Design a protein around this ligand. Structure first.
Ligand SMILES: O=P(O)(O)O[C@H]1[C@H](OP(=O)(O)O)[C@@H](OP(=O)(O)O)[C@H](OP(=O)(O)O)[C@@H](OP(=O)(O)O)[C@H]1OP(=O)(O)O
Ligand code: NA
Lengths: 170, 168
């Protein structure tokens, strides 16, 4: 996969969010961009463009610092999903895959920490019903679902119980 | 009451078109004989009326096709399981149309092989949506889908699973 840059959120590229016509059962979503890669930043922007009125895009670095780069978190309400956007890469110390440098266990811990910090600062009280993992690298179908089922358990271990889907960015 | 016996006598599904998807086709699996469930299944197929197949299946694993052409299925496939979620009086033993999560997984794995003996599609589904026509709690929904994932994944059938309510 591509080289991993997930440091120093303030420096990150921002892609223009373009609304496109081309009706979801969620009322809002947080699109969580997890590395500073142009393909990844574009896929995050495109997801928000598909639902421009109720999408918030957050970039978050390995230190846990985040920036809202699109949308209004105050407006978030109802049934929410999260879409995580990153590159899945093979690991050399296991047969597990890593999403933007995170293992499923590390990702769940990071996301639980992010949720309380983000609900803290933004002063909103809501939790995702569903989490989508949107991989911009083409890793195999098995390792995709393997990561997802690992992630479900790890999310559960961390106090957030969610449906999870894994797919490839179009 | 639960009516999941004798699929030949079930109310049938009439699908009105309605207005893509990342799935190239789907099987809507109707799990009980009930007007609300039957209407929900028809509603689902109405959203993709040219690539959706509706199947009804009883408590014996016998089934029938009531909408669409199975032989035209291929590509990335979704299954949507439609029924009424009911409480067993054991907290996270919620049952969908009489089936616990384990029994649902066994049933669906048995249906796929049985279905392929006649249609010969053998296309593993990428995704399974459980569509509950009764209001079931958020935690029970997730717990149900979680057990279902585990049974499916243990049996070699690794899929994404989501659990929701239908409109009614
Ligand atoms: O609105 P629905 O008919 O219920 O189908 C949606 C929709 O799928 P399609 O529009 O492609 O048919 C979503 O697609 P997008 O939100 O990506 O545009 C998909 O969301 P995901 O891609 O995150 O999977 C989601 O699937 P799910 O929420 O189960 O993961 C699925 O809703 P259901 O399959 O649950 O009914
Ligand atoms: Na759909």
């Amino acid at each position: 996969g591509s080289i991993l840059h997930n440091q120093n959120v303030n420096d990150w590229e921002r892609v223009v969010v373009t609304p496109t016509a081309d009706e979801s059962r969620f009322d809002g979503q947080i699109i969580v961009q997890m590395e500073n890669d142009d393909v990844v930043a574009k896929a995050a922007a495109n997801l928000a463009g598909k639902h421009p009125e109720s999408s918030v895009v957050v970039q978050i670095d390995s230190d846990g610092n985040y920036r809202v780069v699109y949308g209004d978190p105050s407006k978030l309400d109802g049934k929410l999903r999260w879409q995580l956007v990153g590159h899945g890469r093979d690991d050399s110390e296991s047969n597990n895959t890593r999403l933007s440098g995170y293992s499923a266990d590390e990702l769940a811990v990071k996301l639980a920490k992010f949720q309380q910090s983000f609900n803290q600062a933004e002063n909103i009280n809501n939790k995702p019903d569903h989490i989508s993992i949107v991989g911009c690298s083409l890793v195999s179908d098995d390792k995709q679902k393997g990561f997802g089922h690992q992630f479900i358990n790890a999310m559960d271990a961390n106090g957030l119980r969610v449906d999870v889907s894994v797919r490839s960015s179009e």
